Amino acid sequence: MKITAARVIITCPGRNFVTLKIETDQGVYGIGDATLNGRELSVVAYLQEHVAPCLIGMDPRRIEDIWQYVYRGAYWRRGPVTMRAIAAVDMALWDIKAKMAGMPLYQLLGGRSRDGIMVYGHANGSDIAETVEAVGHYIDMGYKAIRAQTGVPGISLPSVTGWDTRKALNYVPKLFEELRKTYGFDHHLLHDGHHRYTPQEAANLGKMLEPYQLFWLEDCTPAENQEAFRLVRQHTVTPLAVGEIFNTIWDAEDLIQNQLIDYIRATVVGAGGLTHLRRIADLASLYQVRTGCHGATDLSPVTMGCALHFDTWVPNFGIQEYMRHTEETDAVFPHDYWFEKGELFVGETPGHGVDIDEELAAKYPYKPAYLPVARLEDGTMWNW
Amino acid sequence: MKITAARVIITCPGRNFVTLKIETDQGVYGIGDATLNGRELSVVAYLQEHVAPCLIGMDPRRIEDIWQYVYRGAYWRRGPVTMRAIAAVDMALWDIKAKMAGMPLYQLLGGRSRDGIMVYGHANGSDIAETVEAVGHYIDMGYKAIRAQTGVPGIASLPSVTGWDTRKALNYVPKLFEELRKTYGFDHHLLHDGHHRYTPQEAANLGKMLEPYQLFWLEDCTPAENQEAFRLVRQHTVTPLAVGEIFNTIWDAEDLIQNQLIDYIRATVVGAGGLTHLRRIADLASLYQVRTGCHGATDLSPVTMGCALHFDTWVPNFGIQEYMRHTEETDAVFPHDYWFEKGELFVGETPGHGVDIDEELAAKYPYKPAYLPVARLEDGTMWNW
Ligand SMILES: O=C(O)[C@@H](O)[C@@H](O)[C@H](O)[C@H](O)CO
Ligand SMILES: O=C(O)[C@@H](O)[C@@H](O)[C@H](O)[C@H](O)CO
Ligand SMILES: [Mg+2]
Ligand SMILES: [Mg+2]
């Protein structure tokens, strides 16, 4: 058996999405997500100009060998661009293998460990009053868990957002106090610090959030230096989550082994496919750390398909982030998974259950779009 | 003052090179290297399609701000492609800054700490005898330091596949160095590149066997994604350790340095985010007496070498600089102010990093796909080349 083509397909039905389709001399084919929000074309070139030509002629059934080949062979290892390409390949290969085996992907990983996949919604508001109402809305819809984010009163090319930590420190804890007073403690409440705090400030925020029993406080402080979470972990029992921007297990080995986090957010597209995410989930499992896969809209339905198959099997499953795609996106990427009363469900279609309608995809041309950047009040470049 | 253009130039005068040229509304312009061997076009896209557009209109004098902007603004941080793009931008801006100051770059970093820059050459051979001969040649050319690599007897359009067997290497390599010292004595720095082929225990074993031959260093003995991998090596041998040519940020070497597991950090100006970031890596290293030993193979353009030599000229904890000669064509395409003489490199007094690019001449050498090799164990196992 041989790979006869590895094509990259770009479409923009609501936002940019890059897909890889691996074709074989047998007919069966597979697709993988390679979308890197804000730097999409870098992965396209990585795949088309470099990886693709090497895949031709290889035996697609050798998922592990090809993963190692693309990972080690690159010589310059790890990285956002590099791992996205590897993930796209890995996803396409597992898709092919599941199809050939005639089973939905989760069966190959080890079968299902659960039925539905708990997810959390995005309750946003310009202020507390508005955010509180938004959480009520997600509660009405059947969500067992809701992430609450609020604007802080007083706070194409990349947009520029402002930030001031002291204002956030004084406001955010009031949001959650109001949420608990209003809705009680029967719901999982989450918060994304979005890399804005130093370890000490994160420790301060976490301790102030303790009486509100949050499901987790995410990406509280930049994690390039994994020891950064030590101070936070030492000063608070608020659950900690991190990892959406991670691309390999090395970005989290110390956070996990030193028990500095409760949820690992790495995704199938961000951390090199099922092959590598599995290793990350395994290490986490040893320390009772659970999966809490990132799932914003900049991850295509292909990723969500693969993520749900993963979530259906993984023992130490924690939760799955869920952001709805547009109708156009859903048309370009027909899939076998659906939402129902706060839970996602993966179908029984062989492969990861997702496909790409190339003809329809061609009707939505690439359109550049950047993620925002943040600056402090004095103009200092900060973390968005 | 504003950036009016940030163009990417591709040329292949002997091998592929990617260059970024930042222009301003003041006449002065700067260039930086963005070459990532075997994956060149991904950096071209990263820069061309995403970063360049954002640079238009920014104040080129704000080197730190722009570095932080591209580094943090990317959201998805670190990585070989990401850092190569950032390094190119940084090099071009420091180049512009030094030109505007009317001084060669090293003056801005803090002035020269030395005259010449010691380099080491590449003595290779298919077997010990041939390799011993090559070392003698390099010694004849006046090299004070020589890296000696030998093929082991029992062991470009697309990735070539090379074979590997650790046991055979372990039995053969120590004999190379034993022969070298017996033939040339100990009045020469001798270096060896393990090139990621060994596990930590095997590297400890190799290092220990090499101890009698006093090596200047044993480089990249074992994969370092897990910085703890050098702990076993360091605890079992006194042979000096070097690592880092494939690193792209200070976070790839933080623990290696602070836990004193290495003696030389090999990170480069193009691999680790430019002068701005490499300086931070050098500063951390000096606190533990770790010295610089910047990688410098041919896949790094003269723009990188120029920047590296300015950095080497200033940095106090300088150790050594790798030097692989570029082809005449490459030297013609990239006019530069630095030269070699009796085992040392010297950077010139030309304002900026002293390097430039002849765009008209560069256009005469079309890009040509070329990959690095891959290695597989005897049983077919994908390994580290
Ligand atoms: O946790 C989250 O949902 C956010 O961090 C993401 O929306 C993130 O900002 C985007 O995925 C970046 O592309
Ligand atoms: O230390 C060295 O000289 C080698 O490791 C390099 O030639 C390396 O193989 C290449 O620079 C990779 O592009
Ligand atoms: Mg987040
Ligand atoms: Mg090397």
Swiss-Prot record, chain A:
Residues annotated as binding substrate: N37, H122, E244, R265, H294, D298, E321
Mutagenesis or variant effect for R147K: Decreases catalytic activity
Enzyme class: lyase
Pathways per UniProt: Carbohydrate metabolism; pentose and glucuronate interconversion
Cofactor names: Mg(2+)
Superkingdom, natural source: Bacteria
E.C. numbers: 4.2.1.8
Catalytic reaction list: D-mannonate = 2-dehydro-3-deoxy-D-gluconate + H2O
Keywords of the record: Carbohydrate metabolism, Lyase, Magnesium, Metal-binding, Plasmid
Active site per database record: H194 (proton donor/acceptor)
Annotated site, Important for activity and substrate specificity, chain positions: A296
GO molecular function, one term: mannonate dehydratase activity
Outcome when changing R265A: Abolishes catalytic activity
Cofactor descriptive note: Binds 1 Mg(2+) ion per subunit.
Coiled coil: none
Binding residues annotated for Mg(2+), in chain numbering: D192, E218, E244
Alphabetical list of CDD domains matching this protein: RspA
One GO BP annotation of this record: amino acid catabolic process
Assembly and binders: Homotetramer.
Similarity comment: family membership: Belongs to the mandelate racemase/muconate lactonizing enzyme family. GalD subfamily.
Role description: Catalyzes the dehydration of D-mannonate. Has no detectable activity with a panel of 70 other acid sugars (in vitro).
Protein name: D-mannonate dehydratase
Gene name of the record: manD
